[PDB]
Design a protein around this ligand. Structure first.
Ligand SMILES: O=C(O)c1ccccc1O
Length: 119
């Protein structure tokens, strides 16, 4: 029932993601010189370094907020891809499955901690 435990759990999950080869296209903001039409399709760029920095700055109030930003990295890849069989989009799908399988317990534990506190 540790209400604060999600933060270190998310830091550790981000460490695992940064080690994953599938995260390489998503570690830093999409290079706008390499993809000049990116902002014509994507309204809100997001990347894992931004997520980590937001977390480290103390600017997430809950793991659900972090999860919304990570999910935005994946939805941006899905929206920008010219093909559902592209290399970068295929990496995003694997990385998304890995993230979802690991974040589930972080969210569950946080929500359980809040409920225990309210009780
Ligand atoms: O699928 C792609 O080719 C792609 C390229 C740049 C950024 C995100 C992407 O999904």
């Amino acid at each position: 029932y540790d209400i604060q435990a999600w933060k270190k759990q998310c830091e550790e999950l981000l460490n695992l993601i940064f080690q994953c080869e599938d995260s390489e296209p998503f570690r830093q903001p999409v290079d706008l010189l390499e993809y000049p039409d990116y902002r014509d399709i994507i309204d809100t760029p997001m990347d894992f370094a931004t997520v980590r920095e937001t977390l480290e700055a103390g600017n997430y109030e809950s793991p659900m907020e972090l999860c919304k930003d990570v999910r935005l990295i994946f939805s941006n890849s899905k929206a920008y891809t010219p093909s559902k069989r592209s290399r970068i989009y295929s990496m995003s799908l694997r990385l998304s499955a890995f993230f979802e399988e690991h974040i589930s317990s972080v969210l569950s534990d946080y929500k359980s901690a809040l409920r225990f506190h309210k009780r």
